[PDB]
A paper describes a structure:
However, Hsp90α and Hsp90β share ~95% identity in this binding site and only two amino acids differ between these isoforms, making the development of Hsp90α- or Hsp90β-selective inhibitors most challenging.
Based on this data, substituents at the 4-position were investigated to determine selectivity and affinity against Hsp90β in silico. Additional derivatives of the 4-position were then prepared and included the 4-methoxymethylene and 4-formyl moieties. Introduction of the smaller 4-formyl group led to both improved selectivity and affinity for Hsp90β (Kd = 310 nM versus 1.55 μM, ~4-fold selectivity); however, the 4-methoxymethylene-containing compound (3) did not bind either Hsp90 isoform at 10 μM. Examination of the co-crystal structures revealed an alternative binding mode for appendages at the 4-position, as the formyl and cyanomethylene appendages adopted a conformation wherein these moieties orient toward the back of the pocket, instead of the predicted forward orientation. While an increase in affinity was observed, modifications at the 4-position did not produce increased selectivity.
Numbering used by the authors: -1 to 217
Amino acid sequence: GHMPEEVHHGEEEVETFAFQAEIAQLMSLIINTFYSNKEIFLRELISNASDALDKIRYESLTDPSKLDSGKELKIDIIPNPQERTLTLVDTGIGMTKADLINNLGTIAKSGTKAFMEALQAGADISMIGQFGVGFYSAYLVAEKVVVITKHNDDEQYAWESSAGGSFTVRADHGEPIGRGTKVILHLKEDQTEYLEERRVKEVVKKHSQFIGYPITLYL
Ligand SMILES: CC(C)c1cc(C(=O)N2Cc3ccccc3C2)c(O)cc1C=O
């Protein structure tokens, strides 16, 4: 053939953005600081999933066709010892691309700044959910976090950050999740206990025993 060259893709495939400084500061705090009960990261992620499931469960009352992307409201947890990943998948309402960028990169500024002020005044890490920013507690155990999300009104997107002050967002051309959010935790070397499922059960039973949706473990 010839050697055509595509000088210009139609649209930027991957976009990289900086966190608001206060979000980056909290992430650095979380990822570098000792905490005696890091298992609370799972409670915070399950709590976000439960809220997203509540959200779609409500809108299904007005519009039952919002469930055409999936009728089951559930949470699945998948440890992968060979990849050192722990994955949380929910069939909640999901996030549009705009809300993915805004919620994780920008408007968490107020909660993260108030939480750091509370920490300086004597609060501790386990209170992070009272400031609406419990998601960042993932970096207690993870060196890298991927968020895959699909909202009925938008396309499936992938967010990722290793807490170096920036994150990337891209169209996800991967396994389609239908609707909801998938959080993939790339675990730190010394936190692989959360790949053992005797441990994961322990943590769910301790912290999330009264979530109103089924939690299934895959191993
Ligand atoms: C990345 C993190 C913040 C997260 C987001 C969602 C999500 O898609 N939301 C959460 C929420 C809450 C209230 C209304 C709508 C939505 C939409 C989720 O299901 C799980 C997590 C795992 O921590």
